[PDB]
Amino acid sequence: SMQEEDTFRELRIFLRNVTHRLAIDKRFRVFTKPVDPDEVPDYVTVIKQPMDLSSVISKIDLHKYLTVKDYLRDIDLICSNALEYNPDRDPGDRLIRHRACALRDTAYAIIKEELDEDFEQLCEEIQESR
Amino acid sequence: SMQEEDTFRELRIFLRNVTHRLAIDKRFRVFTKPVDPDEVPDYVTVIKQPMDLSSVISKIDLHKYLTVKDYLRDIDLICSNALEYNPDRDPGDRLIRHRACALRDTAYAIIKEELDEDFEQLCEEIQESR
């Protein structure tokens, strides 16, 4: 229904906005693009579901997110992939791991602040109906 | 967070170490303690921010340094104060000015040698987040 489609259009505008804010933060630059298959040929062999912010934008435009909870599922993935791939004690890994949690925490905190629970609740129920 | 506090604890151990090395150098003995308000009553009237190595130790223990860049700010201060206060052509001033620059140069060169840039970079980003 047109009313349902408009609900999801509003969600999409919001998710693009949140993602664009994450993507312009200098700390998160490493998470903005997919890992280059050459530079890191072993990335594919350790991470089963690569995720990054430009992919997240593709999925938005492909109507793949019907809730915020589904969006955050992918943000968590970005964080959890970075933690898995870069687990070492050395400072360079610590920096990436903090940057990864900072990205996650930031996304949640924006949503906690700006999302109407009833709008999210509506999105969820349209989704269950499908 | 515990992880953040541990980052800053590592910084503090390092800064104490660097400062203790500066403080045991005979050249730098004059910079180890605050200017005695009686011996030099006019020190307060010309220098706006007194600084010395034992004060630097106090600030470390008071969690006042979150980066190395903030520590070096105070080392620069020690140097610049000595240059302001003792500007004369006479050899006794030259010696103090030379020791002051030697202290600064030494502190920077230790840091350049021993500090991981990614550790410092992490410290900076935790600081910006606060």
Binding site: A102, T106, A107, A109, I110, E113, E114 | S129
Partner: peptide, 5 residues
């Protein structure tokens, strides 16, 4: 908001 980290 969300800009402190």
């Amino acid at each position: 908001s969300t800009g402190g980290k």
